[PDB]
From a paper:
Between the RedM-SAH and RedM-SAM binary complexes, there are distinct open and closed conformations, respectively. The homodimers of both unliganded-RedM and RedM-SAH structures superpose well on each other (rmsdCα = 0.175 Å, 553 Cα) and comparatively poorly upon the RedM-SAM homodimer (rmsdCα = 1.244 Å, 593 Cα) due to a substantial displacement of the C-terminal Rossmann-like SAM-binding domain. Lastly, Chain B of the RedM-SAH complex and unliganded-RedM chain A have slightly rotated Rossman-like domains compared to their dimer partners with an average Cα displacement of 1.8 Å between each pair. The cofactor binding pocket is outlined by the C-terminal ends of β4-8 and clear electron density shows the cofactor is held in an extended conformation similar to related small molecule methyltransferases. The main chains of C185, A186, and G188 form the foundation of the cavity between the ribosyl and methionine moieties, while D182 hydrogen bonds to two conserved water positions creating the basis for a network of hydrogen bonds bridging the α-amine to I183, Y280, and G249 via its amide nitrogen. The carbonyl groups of G184 and G249 receive hydrogen bonds from the α-amine, while H250 and Y280 donate hydrogen bonds to the cofactor carboxylate group. The ribosyl hydroxyl groups interact closely with D207, representing the second conserved binding motif in SAM-dependent methyltransferases. The adenine ring is clamped between F235 and L208 and capped with a hydrogen bond to D234. Docking search with 3 on the open conformation places moderately favorable poses at the junction of helices α7, α11, α15, and α′1 and αʹ2 of the dimer partner, an average of 20 Å away from the bound SAH cofactor. D15 may be engaged in a salt bridge to R163 joining the N-terminus to the interdomain helix (α11); however, this interaction only has unambiguous electron density in one monomer of the RedM-SAH complex.
Among bisindoles, reductasporine is distinct due to its dimethylpyrrolinium structure. Its previously reported biosynthetic gene cluster encodes two unique tailoring enzymes, the imine reductase RedE and the dimethyltransferase RedM, which were shown to produce reductasporine from a common bisindole intermediate in recombinant E. coli. RedE reduces compound 4 to didemethylreductasporine, and then RedM catalyzes two methylations to give reductasporine. RedM is a homodimeric protein with monomers consisting of a largely α-helical N-terminal domain (α1-10, β1-3) and a Rossmann-like fold C-terminal domain (α12–16, β4-10) bridged by a long interdomain α-helix (α11). The C-terminal domain possesses a Rossmann-like fold typical of Class I SAM-dependent methyltransferases, with a β-sheet of five parallel strands terminated with two antiparallel strands each interspersed with α-helices.
Residue numbers in the entry:
A (entry chain A): 12 to 134, 147 to 344
B (entry chain B): 12 to 131, 157 to 344
Write the structure that this text describes.
């Protein structure tokens, strides 16, 4: 019945917390070498004997742990993605959800009532892990972005608000004819340059320190805005599109990607939940639809635009000057 | 990919809070009389304009509201079961989750580390009550006592369903007012009585059948076995004890509701726990009951029955 599906979603915070706590505990990392019996896993996590078995078996019943003859083991997904120290480790996402996001969303009612953010504005190694996970998700968007656009038509690309440069680096690795410029605040420069040095791209990639609310954007054939316009109130986003249009040549493109809401605002749960995340986290940020963005790009003067799926929950709007 | 499913479970607290806040705001009760445009719904709920449309549309995307021409309406399920004031209302589970359980489960880590609790319905009991009345041949018995009866919903339904029965509700004295109200509502008169007491301090009422609905799981195992001993002492030869719980499956690898309930018991009680049918049958045999059986009762709730 539909009411059963609804109650299951409404009480989803419990199953959520089980996985979140397991990640915060590093439970899956303790099983990376091989299976462990219940008492050994409990002792390594320093859990009380009262509920350790229940906790482990809940993970088994949720499909994220295996158990055979009293010994628990990783599933293929947790061995691959929830083992700390591996290059593919995404557990930092869950670690940050457990440490911060879970309680932040506990203030949804007050954010909805006041319209005001409910995080630190209202009031160590987990940040590295979370940043590793962000770089991971960024890489997925970057792999798709490299294949979704005919990059042979362009010679230069500028990533606006590039952070550590993951998308830009992967783009230039997949398309060796491209030259790239990452644009971000000066404080981002060392993280970006460490990835630049690791990539071996050399002079093909540069960083420009800047504030995009106070100076022009680098000229390039393609400008990329990944998770940029959504952080700000709309007049500030339109300012950025004007600067993008001024930075581009004729036939150059702007690429905007976000966890966009579907145009009819009735299908895309992750995009709509992200709009609520922007409520809780920023003064004026917001998630939007592709159709919203196409209207802004038309106001800014772009000749044409289209919405296109990217990967995971991400999609993009591409416009031509 | 199974990893995409894992990540959807892990972040399920977001969609959960959307629904919980909706239920605590009575949003579906506001749409009970008819559809409303977003602004009118925003005004009636006292929500800020920044995010009201996002919130309403998330509920549409989750499939619990419908929207057309800018007007929102209940779905059939939310009109049938999430509208306050109706006897079928199931939203009390959601309201208490939003007020208490969401943040309580935020302390799951401390519970697991310390083993200590971290905390310091009539409709949902009615589904079990109806199933209990139909799953047991109550014509074989004359009297029934419900041990820890709360407001008496299950016992009242049994007596309404089987008019030959005489019933006794047993609970702490503080529960008696709420029992008396439901007893007065039922018109059952002399066929139903409340007995105040503490089942760890005094014997249980004698009856042909004793019912333990969501009792044993609240207590450490020695105390649960003590209750089964007292049930054996209170029953006649051929009498039955009826236990119902959201039992974990015997292999302890599939029943997510039962396993989550055991963690709920961790967070809420000093020594309670969820258990399996096989567990309960062993306890019943140790207590001297002749025979026992486990059957599904109603959705996630199962029943263990034993005969003296
Ligand atoms: N005023 C400003 N000028 C330049 N960059 C800014 C800025 N304000 C914020 N940023 C940058 O914008 C980025 C937003 S996070 C987005 C990072 C990346 N595009 C991705 O998709 O993962 C941050 O790296 C932040 O440093
Ligand atoms: N020591 C005690 N003596 C008698 N009743 C007790 C008790 N300790 C707890 N209880 C009762 O046990 C009940 C547990 S809640 C379960 C209520 C009911 N059987 C149902 O399924 O809905 C509460 O009503 C509480 O009042
Ligand atoms: Cl150029």
């Amino acid at each position: 019945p539909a009411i059963d599906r609804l109650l299951q979603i409404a009480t989803g915070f419990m199953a959520s917390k089980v996985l979140l706590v397991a990640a915060s505990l590093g439970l899956f990392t303790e099983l990376a070498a091989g299976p462990l019996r219940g008492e050994e896993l409990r002792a390594r996590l320093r859990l009380h004997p009262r509920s350790a078995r229940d906790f482990f078996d809940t993970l088994v019943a949720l499909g994220v742990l295996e158990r055979t003859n009293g010994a628990y083991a990783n599933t293929p997904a947790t061995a691959q993605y929830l083992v700390r120290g591996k290059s593919a480790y995404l557990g930092g996402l869950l670690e940050m959800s457990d440490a911060r996001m879970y309680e932040l969303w506990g203030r949804l009612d007050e954010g909805l009532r006041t319209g005001n953010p409910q995080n630190e504005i209202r009031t160590p190694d987990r940040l590295d892990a979370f940043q590793q996970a962000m770089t991971g998700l960024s890489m997925r968007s970057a792999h798709a972005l490299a294949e979704a656009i005919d990059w042979s038509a362009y010679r230069t690309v500028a990533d606006i608000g590039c952070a550590e440069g993951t998308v830009l680096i992967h783009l230039l690795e997949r398309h060796p004819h491209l030259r790239g410029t990452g644009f971000d605040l000066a404080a981002v420069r060392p993280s970006f340059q460490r990835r630049h040095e690791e990539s071996g791209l050399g002079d093909r990639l540069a960083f420009r320190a800047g504030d995009f609310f106070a100076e022009p954007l680098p000229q390039a054939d393609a400008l990329v805005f990944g998770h940029i316009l959504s952080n700000w109130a709309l007049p500030k986003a339109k300012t950025l599109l004007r600067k993008a249009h001024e930075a581009l040549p004729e036939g150059g493109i702007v690429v905007i990607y976000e966890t966009l809401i579907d145009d009819e605002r009735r299908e895309n749960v992750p995009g709509l939940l992200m709009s609520l995340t922007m409520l809780l986290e920023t003064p004026g940020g917001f998630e939007y639809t592709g159709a919203d963005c196409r209207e802004w790009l038309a106001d800014a003067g772009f000749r044409e635009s289209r919405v296109q799926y990217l990967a995971g929950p991400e999609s993009m709007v591409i416009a031509t000057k």
